[PDB]
């Protein structure tokens, strides 16, 4: 009986749909170890509400279902229906009425059209998730698209050789949309898209700014949570995906029938031809399906007990360490494979250079506890391909015992939140132990030097997509997130900020000056610290989110980049360029090893020395006592720095003075003749400030950062 | 430091010739070492180093350095400094020279001497003491190789390869296979180059086998206890490195010649369309337990590489029965094994692996978990998930029997099949269901966990135990030659000498023997599942009753190619039987027979009959028997080829009469034509065709295959 | 609607080797099987004979035994297919054909109206009425 | 037929090593033959065949078969069955081993002997007779 249409058993590998040119057809592979039956659905361009044909996948090799359909080609719209037990109290949530998205889809055509029919359980019903809604979800769920993987990376072969070293890096965090939406410079149809981000105009901008790598915010195909839709909002950031292989359909300038995957590749190709690295922000910890009560789009319907971490004693409920409703079960073989298959895909196929993991800790969750030696991390560390790319983590989730700073494996850089906080509080006026500030400035050896890590492990940042922007960090004492419609309940409450004398926009020049000088104090500190600096895209443009420190649902002018620069904004943009240029020119701030705090190579000078107000080396007590002033000298000629050629690297000798004290101070310069080179001063520098000789004293206004270079001793 | 060096990269592990930088990069894992020293030797002097380089750069738990000017061929070794606290498992001894765990070639073997131990051999306090003798002049050196090598036309067999259903595994020993082959020049016998000689490839092709399973080829060491008693390690199940081809099977030296010889061998086999599966040992090491030598791992990072007893750590957990067990739960150890597999696949172009004591690889401390990190990474690896995986589905520890439990992509050696089939033809009466299940692929074992007949590697004989010839010539083992006072080897072989222990002249006994050999072969090549043949059986190989010739590197194991008419005639029987197997899809199925009518056809895909001629029933199915009779309906099989087409075959009637007595079976409906039998005498005219369900007399111990030609 | 009928019919053709043979049916039992690769029946249900074979007709009925075909693919494998019962009634009048042994399941027809329940499956060689100018393809699902 | 074979292609004529299929394709023209047999020999023994394969597939007036496992260097020959009616030009004699008309290499020459004639050399009725000696060696 059966199929009076042509089929082939097909292969279980690789997972997902694959155009097999030599056999004129597509191979469909899908994992589900609990499904009782599976149905493949094929649609046509014209009609995407109801299937034009239904094929029952009868071959199953192990826990993988598969079939080969003759005649299908790239562009084919498809979806799945998975049959199985419906016993919510046991975690078994199969519902063949609900159309599912291929977990291995390389392109998803469109987004979700919210409707009570995409839930699997009767929305209004009294017994909630325990009920079984029998409505067809087909016409409200986007379709999976069979893609054609071929794309001739012109050059690109080349930047695959020696790449942007870890020490010379400078990360730029941007949003594909906001980056170019308000750029009337480009044609009005590539703004806020992949193609736009890699336009000649934008690449020139990045090159001129001098950043080495760009870190795109989530690009995994995502869904706007219903609660945002039902309140006129949308998901701007994108930290809530349903597929880990498809580029977001909404950032595509060329459609969603595969245009998204093509646009993306060209974008990466363009960036690499300009010598720019590409790091993508990835969410592998949670899914857009949320907890129970959530929709049944992909995983829940395909194999719920396998993909998600279910509460052991109930399984009807979901363990949530992400704060988003559910947590991905990274301890299941196939789930582990999926994530690893995803990473390898984005690397070898989309030519990505690295990944920044959102709520990274949640990936090391094995049931209720946290193990940094879990199967996932072990396979990652040994993979031939993945062990060659950059890995960055949020070193925490939101669960108990989730703070994993420093604990992350060897390949991993971590976002140094401790740095962000301390440096934020220091310039605010707060007096922290000299040792605390100094440690941060020196790469945080107290955190990573213990576990054999290097300064590279530290991703130092003063601002990011989370919380305030740099402009807002010095313009608000507290958050203003009414615009999100949560009655200002969302977002961090402690921002360790200070509005310089006025909440929001001002005309009080005395307040604007404070502000401009602070922005520079943060930048000088960042680009003068050991470790890898990350800059929040937009800060050079003085981006403002009007005090909203959680603009995750704001797809508008609150987040769009504003390229209309006045003299103030324009002048700060130039300060950032020259500061970044300074960083890149001196190996003394891009070290691979920590300063030891002693004389090296028979030289009569310590590689690093910390001084106090009057001018004497910091001692035992003064080192652990609170301070608002930090002063150190880096001896560039006595550094234990070796380049890949075995040569010892040298640099100038710098004297850094960070005076966070609101009051002026008279610091007594150390021996030698020093020449001023960088400062947060907005006024013109006085002649007696350009060169300080014979350990004289120099007055320094409060909230001022200065970098001097020894020119004689 | 008054010589040129570079920090080098921590990856990849081992030594690597970096042509574009004119030097070698050295990388070595040890998270417990306090200091590391690289040793460079010269051809002329391999006792003492010509130079010592202290590896000062360490990235994470990996030490590394780049030495300008070194090239492929460079002899080298390591010295690892660290804490020596045996009671804690810390066994560092910089006096002992070590072998690079990632060496791709090892120059020579070990020269036994009390100085390669790390502890004072005679001393009263044994493994707790600290012997300070230099082990350098007795330990082979690691060799930096040149990975380059051009596979002509070989990139081709990389497309569609020998399917799982059409397979026939041939287990051979690189040495014995050609040592006694006066046909080849006298300098390539018992070597890689010899195994792939034109003469040998023609032999394999003529025999009709699809794949060859080479026994261990990982560089190994002859245990001191074999050396100290005039013996040697012939099989090779005891390595010290997982990346270097054995130096002794090389026809072109050991300064890299072994890696080159091996590659050409594989290249040659692939150009003849022959698959290559290598037998691998990843569970234990040649360093044995404590008291053992300190050659490689023990000295580099003992607490990381080996499974140490939790409460002591001075002692070693042993689930392999060889002294120690590799710690497959450690990240770097896991990496090493996976790095090894990928190497042998992408670099040496191997097609698959047969894991020795596979179960021991799933040991996480005292228990067995088939969902351990190692197996999970293996299953997801892009490369390794494409090759064949075969396992000994057990180890020697408690709860080590893991038949059927192995992950999805493995097949398993079906010992249950070997035993049952062995006992059936011996005379023993097993439940009809037991024999039938074995013949039908053992669905009772693998059909439960969604596995297919392919998961079953059926075999009646292997390197373990008797050979096929000896299985019917001895009632018990004769392993005196090993010098263990016949204490080693299996005691139960489920065999029978047909009437006389050893060689005989009693023709009546030789006939029994020749008919039995054929009974086993017919059963094997007519069973659902994948058949494995023990190399040499077609030649009627004999180990004179030694069922454990692991330390016999001589005529006891060498293949004897001098064939008389008897041996020669059995060789022809095996060829035609293998040919029969390969010609009928009915014995090479991807799915189990359901035992019912399919596709609206009026016939069951498989039917089991009894002596008088009626379908087996409830009780008769579970009652002991010495006679099995079934009919495979080749035209009603649920078999689909990769093109979606349903495959068909002839209808066969198989009759296996293990009963020592004659029997009169009543043939099922139809006209049957005889096609195969164990009979040595000439078949009588009334036996060639049986029509109208008449009865036919069948002498005891006889196997017959009939083909329906009318119904 | 006719465009869709052609698509599914072409799909049916392509899915069954029994209609895409490289060799002719011999009209006899093959490979020791108890069935003829092809058999032609008459109205009442008996194999066509000498005279009835050369006498004019407006009704054709044959059974293709997909499991007894002398069909070999380029790999030397013998190909198999379902067993079909084809009934072509060109007669303008209705006719009552008596189905051959087995349980048959309807799969294709020229009927435009909806097929009746007693037409979907015919068992135990019963008779089924067939309107004039009607083509039907049945598949044996039990015998 | 209890050994592996494939129908093979009628073109090209002669024997062809098909590397990608690990075997040789044998093709031979004869529009009058009733039956054809392929003979495979080994280096060591070239007097008698080590195996005999009956070419059963015939496309048009061309016989063909694909033998898995054979490689370049394989020694082979044919036996062609047919009507023996000299008075009509039909001279088939399966006792006589034949050379492939499309052979690209022939191993050696002929060893003269009354057995390579098809008719009894001394016989009174000459070319009308039917010598049954094997010409193979």
Automatic annotation (TrEMBL), chain A:
The gene is orf c06021. The keyword Protease applies. Belongs to the glycosyl hydrolase 13 family. InterPro entries: GH (IPR017853), GH13_cat_dom (IPR006047), GlgX_Isoamylase_N_E_set (IPR044505), Glyco_hydro_13_N (IPR004193), Glyco_hydro_b (IPR013780), Glycogen_debranch_GlgX (IPR011837), Ig-like_fold (IPR013783), Ig_E-set (IPR014756). GO terms for biological process: glycogen catabolic process. GO terms for molecular function: aminopeptidase activity; amylo-alpha-1,6-glucosidase activity. PANTHER family: GLYCOGEN DEBRANCHING ENZYME. Keywords: Aminopeptidase, Carbohydrate metabolism, Glycosidase, Hydrolase, Protease, Transit peptide. The keyword Protease applies. This is Glycogen debranching enzyme. Coiled coil: none annotated. Disulfide bonds join 249-256, 500-514. Residues 173-583 form the Glycosyl hydrolase family 13 catalytic domain. The lineage of its organism: Archaea, Thermoproteota, Thermoprotei, Sulfolobales, Sulfolobaceae. Pfam families: Alpha-amylase, CBM_48.
């Amino acid at each position: 009986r059966t199929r009076d249409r042509p089929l082939r058993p097909g292969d279980p590998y690789p997972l997902g749909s694959n155009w097999i040119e030599d056999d004129d057809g597509v191979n469909f592979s899908l994992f589900s170890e609990n499904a009782e039956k599976v149905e493949l659905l094929l649609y046509s361009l014209t009609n995407q509400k109801y299937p034009k044909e239904i094929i029952e996948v009868k071959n199953k090799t192990g826990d993988i279902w598969h079939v080969f359909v003759p005649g299908l080609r790239p562009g084919q719209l498809y979806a799945y229906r998975v049959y199985g037990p419906y016993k919510p109290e046991l975690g078994l949530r199969f519902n063949p009425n609900k159309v599912l998205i291929d977990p291995y889809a390389k392109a998803i055509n469109g987004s979700v059209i919210w409707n009570d029919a995409v839930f699997g359980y009767k929305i209004g019903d009294q017994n909630q998730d325990l009920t079984y809604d029998e409505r067809d979800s087909g016409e409200y769920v986007p379709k999976s698209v069979v893609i054609n993987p071929y794309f001739e990376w012109d050059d690109e072969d080349f930047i695959k050789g020696k790449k942007v070293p870890l020490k010379d890096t400078v990360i730029y965090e941007v949003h594909v949309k906001g980056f170019t939406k308000l750029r009337l410079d480009l044609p009005e149809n590539i703004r806020g898209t992949y193609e736009g981000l890699a336009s000649e105009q934008m690449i020139s901008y990045l090159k001129d700014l001098g950043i080495t790598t760009v870190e795109l915010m989530p690009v995994f195909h995502f869904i706007d949570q219903r609660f945002l839709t039902d309140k006129g909002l949308t998901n701007y950031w994108g930290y809530d995906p349903i597929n880990f292989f498809s580029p977001e359909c909404r950032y595509s300038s060329t459609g969603c029938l595969g245009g998204q995957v093509l646009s993306f590749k060209k974008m990466v190709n363009e960036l690499h031809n300009a010598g720019i690295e590409v790091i993508i922000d990835v969410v592998y910890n949670h899914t857009a399906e949320g907890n129970h009560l959530g929709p049944t789009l992909s995983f829940r319907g395909i194999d719920n007990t396998a993909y998600y971490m279910l509460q052991p004693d109930n399984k009807r409920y979901y363990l949530d360490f992400t704060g988003t409703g559910n947590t991905l079960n990274l301890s299941h073989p196939r789930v582990i494979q999926m994530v690893l298959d995803s990473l390898r895909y984005w690397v070898t196929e989309m030519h990505v250079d690295g990944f920044r993991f959102d709520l990274a800790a949640a990936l090391a969750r094995e049931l209720y506890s946290v193990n940094m030696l879990n199967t996932f991390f072990i396979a990652l560390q040994q993979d031939p391909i993945l062990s060659q790319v950059k890995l960055i983590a949020e070193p925490w989730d939101v669960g108990q015992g989730g703070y994993q700073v420093g604990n992350f494996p060897y390949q991993w850089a971590e976002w140094n939140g401790k740095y962000r906080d301390s440096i934020r509080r220091f310039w605010r006026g707060e007096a922290l132990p000299y040792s605390e500030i100094a440690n941060r400035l020196l790469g945080s050896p107290d955190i990573y030097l213990g576990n054999n890590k290097t300064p590279f492990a530290s991703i130092n940042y003063v601002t990011s997509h989370d919380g305030f922007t740099l402009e807002d960090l010095v313009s608000y004492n507290q958050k203003h997130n009414e615009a999100n419609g949560f009655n200002n309940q969302d977002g961090m409450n402690e921002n360790y900020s200070w509005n310089c004398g006025a909440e929001g926009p001002t005309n009080d020049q005395n307040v604007v000056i404070c502000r401009e000088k602070q922005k520079r104090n943060f930048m000088i500190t960042l680009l003068v610290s050991q470790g890898t600096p990350m800059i929040l895209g937009g800060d050079e443009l003085s981006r403002t989110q009007r005090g909203n420190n959680n603009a995750f649902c704001q797809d508008n002018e609150i987040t769009w980049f504003d390229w209309n620069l006045d003299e103030r904004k324009s002048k700060f943009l130039e300060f950032v360029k020259k500061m970044i240029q300074f960083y890149r020119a001196h190996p003394a701030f891009r070290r691979e090893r920590y300063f030891q705090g002693k004389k090296l190579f028979g030289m009569p000078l310590k590689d690093v020395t910390f001084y106090t107000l009057e001018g004497r080396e910091v001692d035992e007590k003064t080192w652990s006592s609170p301070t608002q002033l930090v002063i150190f000298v880096l001896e560039g000629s006595v550094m234990d720095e070796i380049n890949m050629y075995g040569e010892r690297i040298a640099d100038d000798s710098f004297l850094i003075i960070l005076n966070a004290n609101p009051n002026n101070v008279k610091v007594k310069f150390p021996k030698g003749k020093w020449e001023l080179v960088i400062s947060s001063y907005l006024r013109e520098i006085k002649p007696e400030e350009r060169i300080i000789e014979g350990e004289k004293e120099l007055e320094i206004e409060g909230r001022t950062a200065l970098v001097y270079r020894r020119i004689e001793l």
